Write an enzyme that holds these catalytic residues in place. Sequence first.
Site, PDB file in Angstrom:
ATOM      1  N   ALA A   1      -6.721   9.813  -5.204  1.00 30.47           N
ATOM      2  CA  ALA A   1      -7.473   9.508  -3.864  1.00 30.47           C
ATOM      3  C   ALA A   1      -6.492   9.805  -2.806  1.00 30.47           C
ATOM      4  O   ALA A   1      -7.004  10.632  -1.682  1.00 30.47           O
ATOM      5  CB  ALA A   1      -8.216   8.361  -3.793  1.00 30.47           C
TER       6      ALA A   1
ATOM      7  N   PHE B   1       0.409   4.300  -0.476  1.00 29.06           N
ATOM      8  CA  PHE B   1      -0.166   5.298   0.496  1.00 29.06           C
ATOM      9  C   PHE B   1      -0.573   4.941   1.847  1.00 29.06           C
ATOM     10  O   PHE B   1       0.080   5.507   2.851  1.00 29.06           O
ATOM     11  CB  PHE B   1      -1.392   5.860  -0.265  1.00 29.06           C
ATOM     12  CG  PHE B   1      -2.061   6.967   0.798  1.00 29.06           C
ATOM     13  CD1 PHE B   1      -1.478   8.215   1.071  1.00 29.06           C
ATOM     14  CD2 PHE B   1      -3.381   6.737   1.140  1.00 29.06           C
ATOM     15  CE1 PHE B   1      -2.115   9.011   1.794  1.00 29.06           C
ATOM     16  CE2 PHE B   1      -4.175   7.646   1.748  1.00 29.06           C
ATOM     17  CZ  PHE B   1      -3.317   8.918   2.510  1.00 29.06           C
TER      18      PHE B   1
ATOM     19  N   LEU C   1     -16.088  10.063  -0.665  1.00 25.89           N
ATOM     20  CA  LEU C   1     -14.793  10.265  -1.509  1.00 25.89           C
ATOM     21  C   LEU C   1     -15.124   9.635  -2.872  1.00 25.89           C
ATOM     22  O   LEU C   1     -15.755   8.676  -2.993  1.00 25.89           O
ATOM     23  CB  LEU C   1     -13.961   8.886  -0.900  1.00 25.89           C
ATOM     24  CG  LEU C   1     -12.811   8.977  -1.688  1.00 25.89           C
ATOM     25  CD1 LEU C   1     -11.710  10.477  -1.913  1.00 25.89           C
ATOM     26  CD2 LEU C   1     -11.685   7.880  -0.878  1.00 25.89           C
ATOM     27  N   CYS C   2     -14.639  10.380  -4.008  1.00 21.49           N
ATOM     28  CA  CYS C   2     -14.943  10.033  -5.174  1.00 21.49           C
ATOM     29  C   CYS C   2     -14.087  10.476  -6.492  1.00 21.49           C
ATOM     30  O   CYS C   2     -13.982  11.562  -6.484  1.00 21.49           O
ATOM     31  CB  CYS C   2     -16.610  10.563  -5.588  1.00 21.49           C
ATOM     32  SG  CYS C   2     -17.057  10.187  -7.112  1.00 21.49           S
ATOM     33  N   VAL C   3     -13.513   9.725  -6.996  1.00 21.27           N
ATOM     34  CA  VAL C   3     -12.667  10.187  -8.149  1.00 21.27           C
ATOM     35  C   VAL C   3     -13.496   9.950  -9.412  1.00 21.27           C
ATOM     36  O   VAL C   3     -14.120   8.654  -9.565  1.00 21.27           O
ATOM     37  CB  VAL C   3     -11.422   9.650  -8.089  1.00 21.27           C
ATOM     38  CG1 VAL C   3     -10.754   9.880  -9.430  1.00 21.27           C
ATOM     39  CG2 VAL C   3     -10.578  10.468  -6.849  1.00 21.27           C
TER      40      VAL C   3
ATOM     41  N   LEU D   1     -23.904   7.330   6.834  1.00 21.44           N
ATOM     42  CA  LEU D   1     -25.073   7.609   5.563  1.00 21.44           C
ATOM     43  C   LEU D   1     -24.545   7.146   4.167  1.00 21.44           C
ATOM     44  O   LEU D   1     -23.350   7.251   3.942  1.00 21.44           O
ATOM     45  CB  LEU D   1     -25.564   8.982   5.559  1.00 21.44           C
ATOM     46  CG  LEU D   1     -26.064   9.287   7.029  1.00 21.44           C
ATOM     47  CD1 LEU D   1     -26.373  10.991   6.792  1.00 21.44           C
ATOM     48  CD2 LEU D   1     -27.310   8.565   7.375  1.00 21.44           C
TER      49      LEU D   1
ATOM     50  N   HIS E   1       0.965  -1.148  -0.164  1.00 21.90           N
ATOM     51  CA  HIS E   1       0.038   0.042   0.031  1.00 21.90           C
ATOM     52  C   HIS E   1       0.979   1.348   0.038  1.00 21.90           C
ATOM     53  O   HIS E   1       1.118   1.744   1.274  1.00 21.90           O
ATOM     54  CB  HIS E   1      -1.024   0.103   1.467  1.00 21.90           C
ATOM     55  CG  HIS E   1      -1.925  -1.041   1.306  1.00 21.90           C
ATOM     56  ND1 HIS E   1      -2.897  -0.913   0.416  1.00 21.90           N
ATOM     57  CD2 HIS E   1      -2.426  -2.455   1.636  1.00 21.90           C
ATOM     58  CE1 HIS E   1      -3.851  -2.064   0.502  1.00 21.90           C
ATOM     59  NE2 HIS E   1      -3.158  -2.823   1.539  1.00 21.90           N
TER      60      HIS E   1
END
Length: 411
Positions: A171, A4, A159-161, A411, A2
């Site tokens: 991200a 990141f 979170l959304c690319v 949510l 990983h």
Amino acid sequence: AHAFWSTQPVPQTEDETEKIVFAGPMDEPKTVADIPEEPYPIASTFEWWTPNMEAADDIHAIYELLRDNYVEDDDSMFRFNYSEEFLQWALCPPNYIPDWHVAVRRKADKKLLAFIAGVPVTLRMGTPKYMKVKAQEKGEGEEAAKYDEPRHICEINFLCVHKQLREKRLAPILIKEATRRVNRTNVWQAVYTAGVLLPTPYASGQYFHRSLNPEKLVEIRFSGIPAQYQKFQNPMAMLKRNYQLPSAPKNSGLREMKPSDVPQVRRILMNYLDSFDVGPVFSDAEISHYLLPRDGVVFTYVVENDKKVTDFFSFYRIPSTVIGNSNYNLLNAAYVHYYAATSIPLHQLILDLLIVAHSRGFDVCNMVEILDNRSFVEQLKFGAGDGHLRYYFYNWAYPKIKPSQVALVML
Ligand SMILES: CCCCCCCCCCCCCC(=O)SCCNC(=O)CCNC(=O)[C@H](O)C(C)(C)COP(=O)(O)OP(=O)(O)OC[C@H]1O[C@@H](n2cnc3c(N)ncnc32)[C@H](O)[C@@H]1OP(=O)(O)O
Ligand SMILES: Cc1cc(CN2C(=O)COc3cc(CCCCC4CCN(C)CC4)ccc32)no1
């Protein structure tokens, strides 16, 4: 590996989290003063943008990005289609920080490219009960209770690319900039959930689904006819019969929640959530925000008899685009939210939940096996799904707990 996550203050493997015995911070203690004042660097062709998530048109823009690019099921048949009113509700609770709503756009044409959102939450996150018993056996009661006070932390979601920009290491940048803005507010932990396995969850729960409109679900391929429904002369008619629900709620004195129920619903919810290891703590303002009814978004019903609120349930709406079927645009899903039962069995309370949701045209009722959600699965005919929801902390060592010890709904 990983590239990141290995650089982040989170447990790195399952083995590491099998070992954690006390709740506490992972990272170097730091101050606001240590944290960069300037946004994290990004390519010159991009810019950071802070949408105003109370401005209709800024909500619309984030709405489009998520509608087109957010979570899909594992066979890309469905994609979440959170509504604009839902987004304003989820992102703007009491005392929200506008800065924690972090977008990336293309500098040239202001094309919206990515998003990530933080909201504040006060969360109980001290050492879980089972580990405190071990602590006390070992004379370590003090270390174990150190971080028991409810903490004002960040809850990250959305979170959304953009599909065009996947696998470009975007991200990590969003996560870094989100972490920076939160630290600059002197908040050092976050809680987040995901349907994917990352390093490293403290709890993980299956998803459960309760068909409300089985003929539609079968059409759109959400469910399918269990090959034991092939034993029957007429599989569809049996499936409809199995899932049929009363057309009116059965608990006398069920009604929608009103503003004057706030204090009582706060008390009974907080009494109940207190029995779980991890769970949010809500002011009256947060109780009204997250539970008072809002058309198309959140629906909350209380049991009142002799004008005392003894029970409540709530569910919220997330439609999903039906990506592979053109006969139906939307799957209308209801998601079990918070509840509490003091006067009736929980299955009897949530049966009314299913009746209302069905009555209001919802296609399926979804939940994760947190809270006491397992206690009504069988009798209310929920089936386990493919998905799992994984719960994570940022910068917080936490022992593994069962999902039935998690009281935080995301949510
Ligand atoms: C104190 C304050 C702290 C605040 C911050 C706290 C942390 C919050 C963290 C965020 C909580 C979010 C909670 C939700 O909202 S979960 C919902 C996530 N959203 C979606 O799934 C929508 C569909 N997918 C996308 O839009 C993109 O695929 C995303 C954006 C998910 C990844 O973009 P892309 O596919 O273009 O990849 P990349 O090349 O840019 O980046 C690859 C790196 O990203 C790691 N990755 C992949 N998926 C996730 C994920 N869901 N959480 C965290 N990390 C994730 C991955 O392991 C790899 O790192 P490493 O393995 O190389 O190390
Ligand atoms: C099949 C099926 C699909 C659905 C609704 N749904 C979608 O439309 C998109 O893909 C899904 C994926 C999942 C499991 C992954 C959920 C991860 C996110 C993590 C971000 N937040 C906090 C909400 C849940 C549940 C429901 C759906 N429910 O059953």
